[model samples]
Target: PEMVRGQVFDVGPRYTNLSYIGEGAYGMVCSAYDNVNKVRVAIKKISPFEHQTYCQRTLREIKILLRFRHENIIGINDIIRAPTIEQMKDVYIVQDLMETDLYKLLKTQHLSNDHICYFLYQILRGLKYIHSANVLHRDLKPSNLLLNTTCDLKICDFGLARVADPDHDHTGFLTEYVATRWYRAPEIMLNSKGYTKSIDIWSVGCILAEMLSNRPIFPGKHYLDQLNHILGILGSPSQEDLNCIINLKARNYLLSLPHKNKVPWNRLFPNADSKALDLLDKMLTFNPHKRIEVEQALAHPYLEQYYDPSDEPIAEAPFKELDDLPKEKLKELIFEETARFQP
Candidate 1:
């Protein structure tokens, strides 16, 4: 396509892309110049539009983005699609381009204590907003976190996210197949039937260490390897904690492993801030229930100077249940969504 060749593809006379940004499993991302707004934007073009699952996932992600208005969550600037139903080979998702993701940046950047504090604060604040919306960001890796030279971070990617029902139990939301391995929480690793927001908190803890050390905190080869690595540092769970695992096989497997003693946080980050280490210790707690929450993590002494009272209380997410629709209906809704947002 012209976009893949780094050429312009006019869309509604508002967005025109004369260049390519990157390509991934979802599709190709292009750098577009917005003539109407006189600014640059990123246009994500999702191809192979014939798959129903892809359509469903894309719509779900778009719906979630439509609901978010926080500084930390990536916002959709606009969506453009073919006007005629038969001409629907490409759908474009537009947003402002972030210079780089945390993953790429961390590979070359050395973060100071000040950088860590503000970065962590922004992440938690973003998580707080999403959690309040009752939406679980199943994926929370460094790669999904977008950043610019200003050190501003925004959470991205929602294909695997689910809207949680506050009134129901955690069983409804927990899925063994959520986050990536390195940043994954123990509960998810052990296939726990139900998990909480603490799962995301666990991921943030891993991220904190990774940013500090410039490598994954837990770099395991496989599933069991991951458990071993996590246990190696955080140690084995207590009998009481093991009993809390609702998955029978997972609980039995845990009982069979050798007991491990907790590794001192100071051993990992010998020169890190004491208050930050204390908060990390709480976040990496083996027990999901004991993991420090995003809101509480933001209030830690390490981030006291950056903390704001206005960030304390989070409002509930205005959630709407996603219905399982037929492929045709899914396509129809996406088309309607495009028209609805048109100026």
Candidate 2:
């Protein structure tokens, strides 16, 4: 099938085209039928060489998807092998086709309290495994969470994900441009010294709040505006909290803004359950250090009904990090990686 810019689908005979799904920043997706496995799949075609960043993100995503395995995390069914290195400008990844994402679902359907609980539970469950593997999903928004007809949810989009440093000092490990503005943590906005997995927790809190209110809690227009939206609701951070901001420019800028009072969570989410509001309080703390960890979030009273120790498992081993190799070397490695999936 032909796609935008006159691109053609040449993803081998094993997969037959059904329809074009959609396009994202990194690639265009299509729904196809896998002849070998006799199943419908979503195929993402990524033009890795469009830019160095795109190439790196593609390699990083492939590396993480190839290793991690969890029911709530989207797993790669197969990666179409390129005929040759010279013809490897585009790469096709085959994955389970989800009916719709949470972003679209929330717009069209009304979700009950139980629906929110189960959805939030699965997100933390998948996140627990991901964090255990030292992988931080830099991007964790509604659109990234795919769902099926039965309400099963899976976390997708690992292009911005990265393996955290053992020492937990992620100063320069991650890109400055990470996560959507509404879901971004305060520390990231302030350009704090370094970040931890707590950033993901902040995102989860934002998602939970959105689920309860049926709209984004902090829909900031820009960088400063986003921070303002968060502070306007959560109230101004204390001096101690302000200390977390390492960038003097950002710190001073924040100080210049008029002090704001914290709005009570109950008032913001009037119809929300007390237990749900409690978890949101813990997850959405202004200080990353004070935010609830994934394990604790899973054990919270709000999610207790769905939590089971045995069912909430962690990764057996941490995912290994890849070195910053040149595009040529990365392409070669990606080609070699795809060969492992060939039957």
Using TM-score, give the best candidate's number.
2
Best of the candidates, lDDT: 2
Clashes of 2: 0
Cα lDDT, all candidates = 0.77, 0.84
Model 1 TM = 0.90
Over 15-58, each residue of candidate 1 has an lDDT whose tens digit, in order, gives 66557767777777777788978988888887635777777778
- Give per-residue lDDT, candidate 2, residue 218: 94
Question: Across residues 1-343, which tens digit of lDDT does each residue of candidate 2 receive?
Answer: 4454467777767888558777787888888888988888999988887566787788888889889899999999888755788877778899989999999988877789999999999999999999999888988999999998898999999988877753654342122654688898877656542336888999999999999988999999986677779989988889998787666677787788888899999999899999999999999999888889999999999998998978998998987644466777778778887887766
- TM-score versus the correct structure, for each prediction: 0.90, 0.92
Clashes of 1: 2
